[PDB]
Amino acid sequence: PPGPPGPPGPPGPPGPPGPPGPPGPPG
Amino acid sequence: PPGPPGPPGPPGPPGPPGPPGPPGPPG
Amino acid sequence: PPGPPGPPGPPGPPGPPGPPGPPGPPG
Amino acid sequence: PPGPPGPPGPPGPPGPPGPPGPPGPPGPP
Amino acid sequence: PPGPPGPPGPPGPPGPPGPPGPPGPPG
Amino acid sequence: PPGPPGPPGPPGPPGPPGPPGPPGPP
């Protein structure tokens, strides 16, 4: 009979950078 | 025959989060 | 006998985006 | 008869971090 | 011959807390 | 004999929200 499934693959790549932060405080 | 190799394993889990975003603009 | 285990699965999906960047500098 | 099923696999990995908290409170007058 | 593989394991625990939010608005 | 163990479970849920940020300035 065939063998069982192989092991899981490696983790995926990192996600992208987050969005820009908010404006700084007013001058 | 021994049987054939089993099927591929499942995909790995999701990658880690991305880095923080860029700084915001000046106030 | 049984076949060997299968090959590894594929890499997982990308992670989520990172969090927002820090606030900009003051005006 | 092949044998009995194997046991359940190990727990998965932790989830990713939660979202950022809300902005802080306003500064003083 | 060996039995089939067991079922996938249980889910992992919740992730860690997110980061603090950004500073509040000026006084 | 028994088959091998299953693969790992799925990832857990996202964590809780972070705390509020600091106070703004005056």
CA nearest neighbour of F18 among A20, E10, B20, E12: B20
The answer for D 1-29 residues in CB contact with E (under 8 A) is 2-29
Contact between B23 and A22 (Cβ < 8 Å): no
Select from F24, C17, C6, A21 the least CA-distant residue to B26. A21
How far is residue B7's CA from residue F14's CA, in Å, rounded to a whole number? 31
E1-27 burial string, b = 16+ CB within 10 Å, else e?
Answer: ebbbbbebbebbebbebbbbbbbbebe
Instruction: Write down the residue that tokens 């990172």 correspond to.
Output: C18
* Residue recorded with tokens 């990713």: D16
| Distance to chain B for C12, nearest Cα, Å | 4
Instruction: Work out the angle at residue E15's Cα, subtended by the Cα atoms of residues E12 and E18, and round it to the nearest 5 degrees.
Output: 170
Residues of D in contact with C23 (CB under 8 A): none
- d(CA D7, CA C21) in angstroms, rounded, equals 44
The experimental method, as deposited, was X-ray
Question: Quick one: which H or E segment has residue C26?
Answer: none
Amino acid at D10: P
